[PDB]
Amino acid sequence: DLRPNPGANKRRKRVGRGPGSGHGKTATRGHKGQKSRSGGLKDPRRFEGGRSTTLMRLPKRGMQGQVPGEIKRPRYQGVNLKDLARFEGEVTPELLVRAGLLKKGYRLKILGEGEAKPLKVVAHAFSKSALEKLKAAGGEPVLLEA
Amino acid sequence: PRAKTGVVRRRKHKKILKLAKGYWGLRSKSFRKARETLFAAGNYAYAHRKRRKRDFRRLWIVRINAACRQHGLNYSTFIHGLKKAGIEVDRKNLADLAVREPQVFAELVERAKAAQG
Amino acid sequence: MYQIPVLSPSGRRELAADLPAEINPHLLWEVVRWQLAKRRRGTASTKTRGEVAYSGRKIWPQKHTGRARHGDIGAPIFVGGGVVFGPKPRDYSYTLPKKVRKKGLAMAVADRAREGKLLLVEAFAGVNGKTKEFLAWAKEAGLDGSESVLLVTGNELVRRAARNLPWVVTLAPEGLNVYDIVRTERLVMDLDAWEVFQNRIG
Amino acid sequence: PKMKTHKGAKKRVKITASGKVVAMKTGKRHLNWQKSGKEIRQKGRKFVLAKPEAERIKLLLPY
RNA sequence: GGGGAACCUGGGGAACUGAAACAUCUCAGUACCCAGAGGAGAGGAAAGAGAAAUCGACUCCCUGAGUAGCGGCGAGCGAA
RNA sequence: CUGUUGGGAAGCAGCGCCAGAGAGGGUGAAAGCCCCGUAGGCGAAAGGUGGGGGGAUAGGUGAGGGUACCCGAGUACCCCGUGGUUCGUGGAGCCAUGGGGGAAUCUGGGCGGACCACCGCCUAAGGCUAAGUACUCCGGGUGACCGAUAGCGCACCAGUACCGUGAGGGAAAGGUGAAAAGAACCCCGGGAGGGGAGUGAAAUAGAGCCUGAAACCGUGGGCUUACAAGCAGUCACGGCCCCGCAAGGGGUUGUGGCGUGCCUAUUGAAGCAUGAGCCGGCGACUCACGGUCGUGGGCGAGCUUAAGCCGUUGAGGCGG
RNA sequence: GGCGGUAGGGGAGCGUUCCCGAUGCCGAUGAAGGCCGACCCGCGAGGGCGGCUGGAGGUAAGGGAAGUGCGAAUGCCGGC
RNA sequence: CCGGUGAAAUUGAACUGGCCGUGAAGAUGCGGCCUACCCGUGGCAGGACGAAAAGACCCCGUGGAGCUUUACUGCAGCCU
Ligand SMILES: [Mg+2]
Ligand SMILES: [Mg+2]
Ligand SMILES: [Mg+2]
Ligand SMILES: [Mg+2]
Ligand SMILES: [Mg+2]
Ligand SMILES: [Mg+2]
Ligand SMILES: [Mg+2]
Ligand SMILES: [Mg+2]
Ligand SMILES: [Mg+2]
Ligand SMILES: [Mg+2]
Ligand SMILES: [Mg+2]
Ligand SMILES: [Mg+2]
Ligand SMILES: [Mg+2]
Ligand SMILES: [Mg+2]
Ligand SMILES: [Mg+2]
Ligand SMILES: [Mg+2]
Ligand SMILES: [Mg+2]
């Protein structure tokens, strides 16, 4: 293809809205008409009316914070073995991040659904009702400790 | 990339002048006056192009009425016979044969006094 | 597609291409644009009613005045005051995914192969610096000034031998800008390129 | 720039996993001088809503 | 000793505005006044960080992160 | 180089040349090869710089055992007000402290969010320290930046004229022609201003001298008007003058048909509700970041970078 | 079969300024702009054509970016 | 009245009659009817609801500002 004639496809050009005209868009600039319109209508999300919002809900969802804030206990993240059959061997968190899971959430636990290739998976924990689902396969050593 | 007005705003005011030709005083040289009286025209011309028939629709009848009453009968009594004769011809204009040879129309009259009396 | 020409130091032979040869222009169209906005140096500006030198003082009271109502003279309704929504300086660049230019690099190269408008080279009567020491090389190779040409080589001598060529634009082995490729109507490159272009994809 | 979440809504609401929004039920720490023991049950359980949840969704969004 | 377009450190320091009223809060230690340091200013070699019987002066960009948290827990504020 | 239109050639045609220089600007119009210059290369007696190299000097260079010497004072620490850290007294630490109580020398002293025990980090109350970082009066390069109502307020004798006592406010205004070659001279006339001749390619380029619109004023010509009731127009026919080939067309209007200006707010107009004397220019949904939906393209259990690092200088690649 | 239409929604287009298209082309045998016209295309906003003036720039087809389209705001400047 | 010099507010535009009705219902401007040659000049002020400074009046605004207080909170000051 030469330099010109490489136009776009279709359904993609901008032609944005130009509401300063005389029969295209209206002489009130689109979504305006009544009044109280030049700056803003406050935030139509959490507010407006001036009644009581809908913040009238109760926030029991506790442990809403202290002072030093969060605390460093490790995030246990699980992983469904459905695609653990994509590979095989002494699979370790070391590469499970390289595959496309965990992502330094760290502390890998295995669980899930499906046939498991008797592939000996080393991790930090295993779901019981899946561990016998592994017991009919191979071997599963545990993490270091805590 | 600035894009001043320039050509655009003038040429338009020249077109309104172009249609405001012969309009009294400021109504043809002052722009936003010429804009106005053009609004009424296109409206005045609209309605009247709907009206020009009713004008002639009326005129024809009087001439017709002028003719029938020169035989001795009214327009109301004239038309019925023609209609009784079932003659979807008479375009109320084409009944202008009162100075376009009359016997052609004078003997349309007697073909009316038939089917009614 | 598969087949490509080469001017060896010992004759005219060919080679087999490892290169996908499908097409999608809305990719290239969506790549040229990137190359062209990223080279846009952000410079345009006007001045809002704050960067204007006029003061901030009402011109005449609105009550009991006869005229209208007004204020400071930076007001865009006046004249010479402030700009409305002027074009303060800003970047136009972004971050187009590499997988669009990588594939976008390949697509265009086969486009010249698909039309034959290609040539890998290796032999040069112009391995030194002279514009005359090249145009005869083009004569003995097949470039008669009819149509444009992009050139790639890792030798800063041949560039000299054509950097003054209106129909031949210089290009280092690396920035194979899809702009200049599609810009020029024919392409030339070397192995010194066809190892990095290969290390990109190949 | 960089939208600020609404911690006054985080502490109150939890975003589901089908996009729905669910809050604890209202009316359980004031009116309880003995009224319907029935009521102290369908108010200790979470409930979902309708239109206004999208008014809430947009108050979160990075979370 | 005084000057210097803006940049920098310290001494003082608002109110409009927002909260669709308004006092805590915000605007904000901003604008403005003062003194001073130069081509830069300030900081700068742990009585540090923060959880590993670990990092190693200080500044600066990115991410962490609008996380943790702060809030008439309301507007909204905002780390390491 | 020549030839040919052209007032003028760089234009057009032919025949060539340079190229590490074909980026630009100027020359009577559009020049790679007429001019300055660009590619590339050489360069200061003097001042400064120094950030790269070198010399010198400042400074610095061992261990084991014992000793019972010293390790920064109204300081540490505690309380009463207080500020900073996201900490609005909150469970409220830590850092600094205005007031009060007031230690100790490694058998010591602070900290790890009240407090205590253990465990770990630190050794305060003396100071200094380049680099990496911000800015643009200044210089350079650059521009999908403007082009005399725009761009800073000033392209120009502008922070002037002008206003105000005063701080302070603060404009308007560019364009003959390539060359003044700028009208000798004659005539009307007091001059100004004009006629002619002349220069000039052009004076219909005349010194507020490129273009010259619109409002506004006047002269000439075609149609009309002194029995007529009007948002000033529309429709029909005839009439007058003009263009044109049959036929048709332009401009005007005498008569007849109908006809309650524009915008805005208003339930509501013709309106005694707002607004505009007119004309011409400036003038009003863009941008940054985050996010919902839609769509176009890339990959697809993956998708993707940010600051930053190598390189021509309108090239990209790494960077997970 | 439907097509009166305000707020409002969707779709489609015309014009301006600038960039790729360009070391390209049109331009002294006259460009942009300004006076006309009863010619032509378009229902349109608009685009071409003949005449006059002006005197040096202007840029197609396909893409891109906007300081983008005026009849009023007792809008502002200037002129009348 | 003649010679000379020569503004203003106002103004959408005008070819601006009366009467009896209608009409958001005060009509030169709509309907009907009556009157009226074109154009000035001197003067009188009934109409054009006349020009408004955004009426000297009333109301609205979660406007402003001055003043009052055993309205609220704080501050100086004073006692302690
Ligand atoms: Mg627009
Ligand atoms: Mg509409
Ligand atoms: Mg409003
Ligand atoms: Mg509500
Ligand atoms: Mg399981
Ligand atoms: Mg009929
Ligand atoms: Mg007859
Ligand atoms: Mg495409
Ligand atoms: Mg005032
Ligand atoms: Mg000749
Ligand atoms: Mg100016
Ligand atoms: Mg300025
Ligand atoms: Mg001015
Ligand atoms: Mg105008
Ligand atoms: Mg132009
Ligand atoms: Mg009158
Ligand atoms: Mg009061």
Side-chain angles (χ1 to χ4, degrees):
Chain A
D1 180 76
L2 83 179
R3 172 56 197 76
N5 288 319
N9 55 17
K10 272 85 169 167
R11 301 263 178 100
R12 200 260 155 257
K13 197 187 184 180
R14 44 168 283 257
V15 290
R17 225 155 191 175
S21 153
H23 223 317
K25 262 69 213 186
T26 318
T28 89
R29 286 286 184 173
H31 61 101
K32 311 216 201 264
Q34 174 73 358
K35 214 63 71 143
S36 157
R37 290 302 308 140
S38 281
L41 299 176
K42 279 286 281 301
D43 163 278
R45 304 180 304 179
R46 46 201 186 185
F47 262 138
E48 277 303 341
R51 37 169 180 254
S52 36
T53 74
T54 326
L55 191 123
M56 31 165 48
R57 57 263 183 171
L58 203 144
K60 114 162 191 173
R61 279 188 203 73
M63 312 303 288
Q64 58 110 348
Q66 305 319 128
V67 163
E70 215 169 354
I71 48 185
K72 196 183 67 72
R73 64 181 111 241
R75 302 123 51 119
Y76 280 120
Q77 166 185 3
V79 47
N80 282 332
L81 41 69
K82 298 180 275 81
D83 271 318
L84 201 33
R86 171 185 71 251
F87 51 75
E88 197 190 332
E90 184 185 19
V91 317
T92 72
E94 173 217 3
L95 276 89
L96 261 303
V97 47
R98 263 66 196 127
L101 281 103
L102 258 286
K103 195 84 169 174
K104 280 165 287 286
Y106 204 46
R107 287 303 203 107
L108 191 156
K109 171 211 251 170
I110 88 164
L111 41 73
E113 44 201 35
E115 172 187 13
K117 310 305 221 77
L119 88 175
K120 295 193 43 143
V121 47
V122 179
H124 304 80
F126 317 84
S127 199
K128 322 177 289 292
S129 190
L131 191 273
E132 179 168 331
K133 213 165 165 312
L134 287 127
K135 184 182 281 83
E140 293 79 59
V142 84
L143 41 63
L144 51 153
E145 314 295 323
Chain B
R2 184 251 191 121
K4 55 173 108 185
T5 309
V7 198
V8 200
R9 198 183 314 168
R10 164 181 61 246
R11 291 182 163 156
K12 302 222 190 88
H13 299 212
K14 307 259 301 280
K15 281 197 271 188
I16 314 290
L17 162 81
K18 184 64 173 195
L19 291 323
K21 298 292 271 168
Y23 282 170
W24 159 290
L26 285 207
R27 204 182 284 267
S28 36
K29 24 192 171 303
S30 49
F31 167 60
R32 44 160 90 81
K33 290 276 102 156
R35 178 83 170 248
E36 294 184 10
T37 322
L38 288 212
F39 285 121
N43 303 7
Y44 286 169
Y46 185 68
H48 291 103
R49 283 177 294 183
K50 287 285 168 61
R51 189 171 205 94
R52 47 168 55 153
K53 295 81 66 165
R54 306 199 220 107
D55 275 335
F56 273 175
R57 293 192 189 182
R58 268 154 153 183
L59 168 68
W60 296 321
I61 298 190
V62 197
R63 289 174 177 272
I64 304 155
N65 188 12
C68 68
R69 303 183 194 259
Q70 210 170 23
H71 263 271
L73 79 168
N74 54 93
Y75 171 91
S76 82
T77 308
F78 164 88
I79 301 282
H80 188 213
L82 283 78
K83 300 301 172 183
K84 221 48 174 177
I87 58 174
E88 81 177 32
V89 47
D90 227 23
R91 154 171 131 150
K92 283 162 176 299
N93 189 325
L94 297 197
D96 74 326
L97 323 175
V99 192
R100 293 184 183 162
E101 303 301 313
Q103 295 172 38
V104 188
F105 171 113
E107 291 294 312
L108 289 157
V109 184
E110 286 290 333
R111 286 189 172 233
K113 305 213 73 157
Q116 51 212 11
Chain C
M1 205 165 174
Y2 291 106
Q3 53 186 16
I4 47 162
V6 165
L7 168 75
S8 147
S10 91
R12 231 189 193 168
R13 66 168 170 112
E14 283 182 4
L15 191 273
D18 192 3
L19 192 83
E22 331 270 354
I23 38 164
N24 179 11
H26 195 84
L27 193 147
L28 291 323
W29 179 105
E30 227 175 356
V31 176
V32 170
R33 147 180 185 162
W34 173 61
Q35 302 183 308
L36 305 212
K38 63 175 311 179
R39 50 98 207 185
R40 207 141 143 192
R41 204 67 260 180
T43 178
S45 156
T46 51
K47 288 201 174 301
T48 61
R49 24 181 311 181
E51 318 101 303
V52 185
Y54 299 69
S55 174
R57 162 181 86 180
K58 211 182 162 313
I59 178 87
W60 32 259
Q62 40 183 20
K63 59 177 291 285
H64 302 257
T65 205
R67 314 293 296 293
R69 41 164 162 87
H70 291 300
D72 83 329
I73 308 274
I77 63 148
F78 287 154
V79 47
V83 86
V84 200
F85 282 91
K88 301 178 139 195
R90 46 80 170 254
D91 175 13
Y92 289 65
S93 63
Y94 32 93
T95 288
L96 168 142
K98 295 174 260 181
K99 200 76 53 55
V100 202
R101 24 171 141 170
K102 169 195 300 274
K103 275 74 179 64
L105 217 41
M107 261 215 68
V109 179
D111 187 23
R112 305 293 206 258
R114 184 175 75 94
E115 284 183 299
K117 303 283 191 287
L118 189 59
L119 184 56
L120 268 171
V121 289
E122 155 72 0
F124 316 99
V127 285
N128 266 15
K130 185 57 59 181
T131 58
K132 273 251 174 179
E133 197 174 10
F134 169 84
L135 187 43
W137 189 63
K139 174 166 289 191
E140 308 274 62
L143 310 88
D144 43 340
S146 177
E147 304 216 314
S148 83
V149 152
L150 175 80
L151 159 75
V152 178
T153 191
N155 174 13
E156 194 80 14
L157 273 162
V158 192
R159 304 196 229 280
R160 305 172 183 177
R163 209 148 194 177
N164 265 9
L165 231 56
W167 56 304
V168 174
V169 278
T170 166
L171 190 41
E174 299 70 18
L176 287 94
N177 44 337
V178 317
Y179 184 69
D180 279 304
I181 303 185
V182 193
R183 204 180 175 196
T184 69
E185 279 206 341
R186 193 186 179 280
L187 192 143
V188 184
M189 50 191 194
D190 80 3
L191 288 193
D192 307 329
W194 211 87
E195 178 190 332
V196 51
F197 190 50
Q198 281 284 120
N199 181 67
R200 294 287 320 278
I201 38 64
Chain D
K2 187 177 168 193
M3 293 189 55
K4 282 178 182 163
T5 68
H6 192 313
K7 274 58 166 282
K10 181 190 184 295
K11 303 183 198 193
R12 299 182 205 259
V13 200
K14 177 153 293 291
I15 278 194
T16 47
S18 68
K20 285 188 214 66
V21 152
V22 47
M24 283 278 305
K25 187 78 181 166
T26 77
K28 210 166 140 293
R29 299 287 176 254
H30 213 327
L31 82 183
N32 311 72
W33 68 324
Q34 174 75 21
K35 69 170 315 188
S36 284
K38 157 177 164 74
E39 267 183 27
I40 77 166
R41 284 192 291 98
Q42 303 80 307
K43 298 192 163 171
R45 84 101 191 261
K46 311 200 204 155
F47 81 104
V48 317
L49 314 88
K51 303 276 193 153
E53 305 184 4
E55 265 212 332
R56 254 101 60 81
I57 295 178
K58 304 166 61 94
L59 288 173
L60 261 74
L61 269 171
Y63 178 59

mmCIF file of all heavy atoms in Angstrom, chain B residues 16-37:
data_model
loop_
_atom_site.group_PDB
_atom_site.id
_atom_site.type_symbol
_atom_site.label_atom_id
_atom_site.label_comp_id
_atom_site.label_asym_id
_atom_site.label_seq_id
_atom_site.Cartn_x
_atom_site.Cartn_y
_atom_site.Cartn_z
ATOM 1 N N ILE B 16 -28.482 36.886 1.503
ATOM 2 C CA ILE B 16 -29.741 37.454 1.962
ATOM 3 C C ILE B 16 -30.034 38.743 1.215
ATOM 4 O O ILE B 16 -31.162 38.977 0.770
ATOM 5 C CB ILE B 16 -29.705 37.663 3.481
ATOM 6 C CG1 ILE B 16 -29.149 36.417 4.152
ATOM 7 C CG2 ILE B 16 -31.091 37.903 4.000
ATOM 8 C CD1 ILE B 16 -30.074 35.242 4.091
ATOM 9 N N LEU B 17 -29.019 39.590 1.049
ATOM 10 C CA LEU B 17 -29.142 40.711 0.127
ATOM 11 C C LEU B 17 -29.536 40.239 -1.264
ATOM 12 O O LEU B 17 -30.326 40.900 -1.943
ATOM 13 C CB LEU B 17 -27.826 41.488 0.066
ATOM 14 C CG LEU B 17 -27.624 42.418 -1.139
ATOM 15 C CD1 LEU B 17 -28.330 43.742 -0.930
ATOM 16 C CD2 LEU B 17 -26.145 42.640 -1.474
ATOM 17 N N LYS B 18 -29.008 39.091 -1.697
ATOM 18 C CA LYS B 18 -29.310 38.586 -3.030
ATOM 19 C C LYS B 18 -30.787 38.272 -3.187
ATOM 20 O O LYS B 18 -31.337 38.439 -4.277
ATOM 21 C CB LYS B 18 -28.474 37.343 -3.322
ATOM 22 C CG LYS B 18 -28.631 36.798 -4.714
ATOM 23 C CD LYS B 18 -28.138 37.803 -5.720
ATOM 24 C CE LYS B 18 -28.115 37.226 -7.110
ATOM 25 N NZ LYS B 18 -27.310 38.077 -8.017
ATOM 26 N N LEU B 19 -31.441 37.816 -2.128
ATOM 27 C CA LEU B 19 -32.877 37.602 -2.192
ATOM 28 C C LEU B 19 -33.671 38.804 -1.717
ATOM 29 O O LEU B 19 -34.868 38.887 -1.998
ATOM 30 C CB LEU B 19 -33.286 36.370 -1.381
ATOM 31 C CG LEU B 19 -32.865 34.986 -1.881
ATOM 32 C CD1 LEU B 19 -32.913 34.916 -3.396
ATOM 33 C CD2 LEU B 19 -31.510 34.573 -1.367
ATOM 34 N N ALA B 20 -33.043 39.729 -1.006
ATOM 35 C CA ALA B 20 -33.693 40.980 -0.644
ATOM 36 C C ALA B 20 -33.314 42.052 -1.661
ATOM 37 O O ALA B 20 -32.470 42.911 -1.431
ATOM 38 C CB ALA B 20 -33.309 41.385 0.771
ATOM 39 N N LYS B 21 -33.963 41.972 -2.815
ATOM 40 C CA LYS B 21 -33.687 42.856 -3.933
ATOM 41 C C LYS B 21 -34.975 43.560 -4.311
ATOM 42 O O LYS B 21 -35.894 42.936 -4.845
ATOM 43 C CB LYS B 21 -33.130 42.075 -5.121
ATOM 44 C CG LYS B 21 -31.814 41.378 -4.841
ATOM 45 C CD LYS B 21 -30.680 42.360 -4.649
ATOM 46 C CE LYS B 21 -30.021 42.696 -5.958
ATOM 47 N NZ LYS B 21 -29.118 43.860 -5.822
ATOM 48 N N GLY B 22 -35.035 44.855 -4.048
ATOM 49 C CA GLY B 22 -36.259 45.595 -4.225
ATOM 50 C C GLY B 22 -37.080 45.729 -2.972
ATOM 51 O O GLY B 22 -38.263 46.072 -3.058
ATOM 52 N N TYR B 23 -36.496 45.460 -1.809
ATOM 53 C CA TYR B 23 -37.198 45.539 -0.540
ATOM 54 C C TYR B 23 -36.957 46.918 0.051
ATOM 55 O O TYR B 23 -35.821 47.395 0.066
ATOM 56 C CB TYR B 23 -36.714 44.448 0.412
ATOM 57 C CG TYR B 23 -37.297 43.092 0.104
ATOM 58 C CD1 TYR B 23 -36.819 41.952 0.720
ATOM 59 C CD2 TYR B 23 -38.321 42.954 -0.808
ATOM 60 C CE1 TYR B 23 -37.347 40.718 0.434
ATOM 61 C CE2 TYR B 23 -38.852 41.724 -1.098
ATOM 62 C CZ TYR B 23 -38.366 40.609 -0.474
ATOM 63 O OH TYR B 23 -38.908 39.380 -0.771
ATOM 64 N N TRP B 24 -38.025 47.551 0.536
ATOM 65 C CA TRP B 24 -37.981 48.971 0.857
ATOM 66 C C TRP B 24 -36.873 49.290 1.846
ATOM 67 O O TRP B 24 -36.795 48.695 2.921
ATOM 68 C CB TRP B 24 -39.322 49.423 1.427
ATOM 69 C CG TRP B 24 -39.260 50.686 2.230
ATOM 70 C CD1 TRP B 24 -38.694 50.857 3.455
ATOM 71 C CD2 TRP B 24 -39.823 51.945 1.876
ATOM 72 N NE1 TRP B 24 -38.841 52.148 3.869
ATOM 73 C CE2 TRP B 24 -39.539 52.837 2.918
ATOM 74 C CE3 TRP B 24 -40.536 52.406 0.773
ATOM 75 C CZ2 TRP B 24 -39.943 54.156 2.894
ATOM 76 C CZ3 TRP B 24 -40.938 53.716 0.751
ATOM 77 C CH2 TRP B 24 -40.640 54.577 1.802
ATOM 78 N N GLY B 25 -36.041 50.257 1.489
ATOM 79 C CA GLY B 25 -35.128 50.834 2.456
ATOM 80 C C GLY B 25 -34.241 49.793 3.090
ATOM 81 O O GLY B 25 -33.689 48.919 2.415
ATOM 82 N N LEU B 26 -34.108 49.878 4.415
ATOM 83 C CA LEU B 26 -33.224 48.983 5.144
ATOM 84 C C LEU B 26 -33.576 47.524 4.937
ATOM 85 O O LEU B 26 -32.719 46.660 5.120
ATOM 86 C CB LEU B 26 -33.262 49.298 6.635
ATOM 87 C CG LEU B 26 -32.542 50.537 7.154
ATOM 88 C CD1 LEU B 26 -32.147 50.315 8.595
ATOM 89 C CD2 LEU B 26 -31.326 50.850 6.317
ATOM 90 N N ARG B 27 -34.811 47.235 4.553
ATOM 91 C CA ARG B 27 -35.259 45.859 4.432
ATOM 92 C C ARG B 27 -34.525 45.092 3.345
ATOM 93 O O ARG B 27 -34.714 43.878 3.231
ATOM 94 C CB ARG B 27 -36.760 45.862 4.177
ATOM 95 C CG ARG B 27 -37.461 44.617 4.585
ATOM 96 C CD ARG B 27 -38.918 44.715 4.242
ATOM 97 N NE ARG B 27 -39.633 45.566 5.181
ATOM 98 C CZ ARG B 27 -40.248 45.111 6.261
ATOM 99 N NH1 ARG B 27 -40.222 43.821 6.542
ATOM 100 N NH2 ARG B 27 -40.880 45.944 7.064
ATOM 101 N N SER B 28 -33.693 45.757 2.558
ATOM 102 C CA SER B 28 -32.924 45.098 1.517
ATOM 103 C C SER B 28 -31.429 45.332 1.610
ATOM 104 O O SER B 28 -30.678 44.662 0.904
ATOM 105 C CB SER B 28 -33.403 45.550 0.137
ATOM 106 O OG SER B 28 -33.774 46.910 0.167
ATOM 107 N N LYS B 29 -30.973 46.264 2.443
ATOM 108 C CA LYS B 29 -29.548 46.481 2.634
ATOM 109 C C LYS B 29 -29.065 46.144 4.032
ATOM 110 O O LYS B 29 -27.954 45.635 4.180
ATOM 111 C CB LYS B 29 -29.174 47.932 2.308
ATOM 112 C CG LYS B 29 -30.312 48.920 2.432
ATOM 113 C CD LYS B 29 -29.949 50.255 1.812
ATOM 114 C CE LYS B 29 -31.153 51.169 1.737
ATOM 115 N NZ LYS B 29 -32.241 50.524 0.972
ATOM 116 N N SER B 30 -29.864 46.407 5.055
ATOM 117 C CA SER B 30 -29.517 45.951 6.390
ATOM 118 C C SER B 30 -29.697 44.446 6.464
ATOM 119 O O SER B 30 -30.758 43.925 6.111
ATOM 120 C CB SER B 30 -30.393 46.635 7.428
ATOM 121 O OG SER B 30 -31.750 46.545 7.055
ATOM 122 N N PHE B 31 -28.666 43.744 6.920
ATOM 123 C CA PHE B 31 -28.733 42.293 6.902
ATOM 124 C C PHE B 31 -29.872 41.790 7.769
ATOM 125 O O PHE B 31 -30.923 41.410 7.249
ATOM 126 C CB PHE B 31 -27.432 41.662 7.379
ATOM 127 C CG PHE B 31 -27.563 40.201 7.661
ATOM 128 C CD1 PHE B 31 -27.946 39.329 6.669
ATOM 129 C CD2 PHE B 31 -27.355 39.708 8.925
ATOM 130 C CE1 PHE B 31 -28.083 37.993 6.928
ATOM 131 C CE2 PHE B 31 -27.494 38.368 9.184
ATOM 132 C CZ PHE B 31 -27.860 37.511 8.183
ATOM 133 N N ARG B 32 -29.693 41.812 9.091
ATOM 134 C CA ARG B 32 -30.628 41.130 9.975
ATOM 135 C C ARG B 32 -32.038 41.685 9.852
ATOM 136 O O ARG B 32 -32.951 41.212 10.531
ATOM 137 C CB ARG B 32 -30.172 41.175 11.440
ATOM 138 C CG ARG B 32 -29.641 42.492 11.967
ATOM 139 C CD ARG B 32 -29.694 42.515 13.499
ATOM 140 N NE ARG B 32 -28.500 42.021 14.179
ATOM 141 C CZ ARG B 32 -27.392 42.726 14.375
ATOM 142 N NH1 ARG B 32 -27.301 43.960 13.915
ATOM 143 N NH2 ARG B 32 -26.370 42.190 15.018
ATOM 144 N N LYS B 33 -32.236 42.680 8.996
ATOM 145 C CA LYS B 33 -33.585 42.973 8.551
ATOM 146 C C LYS B 33 -33.974 42.105 7.370
ATOM 147 O O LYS B 33 -35.076 41.552 7.342
ATOM 148 C CB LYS B 33 -33.724 44.445 8.173
ATOM 149 C CG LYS B 33 -33.667 45.400 9.336
ATOM 150 C CD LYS B 33 -35.021 45.537 9.994
ATOM 151 C CE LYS B 33 -35.092 44.721 11.262
ATOM 152 N NZ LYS B 33 -36.120 45.245 12.186
ATOM 153 N N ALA B 34 -33.082 41.973 6.390
ATOM 154 C CA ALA B 34 -33.388 41.147 5.230
ATOM 155 C C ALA B 34 -33.664 39.713 5.642
ATOM 156 O O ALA B 34 -34.528 39.049 5.063
ATOM 157 C CB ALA B 34 -32.238 41.215 4.232
ATOM 158 N N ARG B 35 -32.948 39.224 6.652
ATOM 159 C CA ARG B 35 -33.224 37.903 7.201
ATOM 160 C C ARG B 35 -34.691 37.751 7.568
ATOM 161 O O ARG B 35 -35.301 36.712 7.302
ATOM 162 C CB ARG B 35 -32.347 37.665 8.422
ATOM 163 C CG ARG B 35 -32.588 36.347 9.107
ATOM 164 C CD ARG B 35 -31.831 35.229 8.435
ATOM 165 N NE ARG B 35 -31.867 34.003 9.222
ATOM 166 C CZ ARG B 35 -30.812 33.463 9.817
ATOM 167 N NH1 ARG B 35 -29.626 34.038 9.717
ATOM 168 N NH2 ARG B 35 -30.941 32.344 10.512
ATOM 169 N N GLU B 36 -35.277 38.780 8.172
ATOM 170 C CA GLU B 36 -36.661 38.720 8.616
ATOM 171 C C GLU B 36 -37.607 38.569 7.441
ATOM 172 O O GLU B 36 -38.162 37.493 7.216
ATOM 173 C CB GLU B 36 -37.043 39.976 9.388
ATOM 174 C CG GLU B 36 -36.341 40.162 10.697
ATOM 175 C CD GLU B 36 -36.847 41.378 11.415
ATOM 176 O OE1 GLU B 36 -37.868 41.926 10.961
ATOM 177 O OE2 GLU B 36 -36.233 41.797 12.416
ATOM 178 N N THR B 37 -37.782 39.650 6.682
ATOM 179 C CA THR B 37 -38.788 39.696 5.630
ATOM 180 C C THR B 37 -38.669 38.541 4.649
ATOM 181 O O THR B 37 -39.614 38.278 3.901
ATOM 182 C CB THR B 37 -38.687 41.023 4.900
ATOM 183 O OG1 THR B 37 -38.402 42.048 5.855
ATOM 184 C CG2 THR B 37 -39.985 41.336 4.211
#
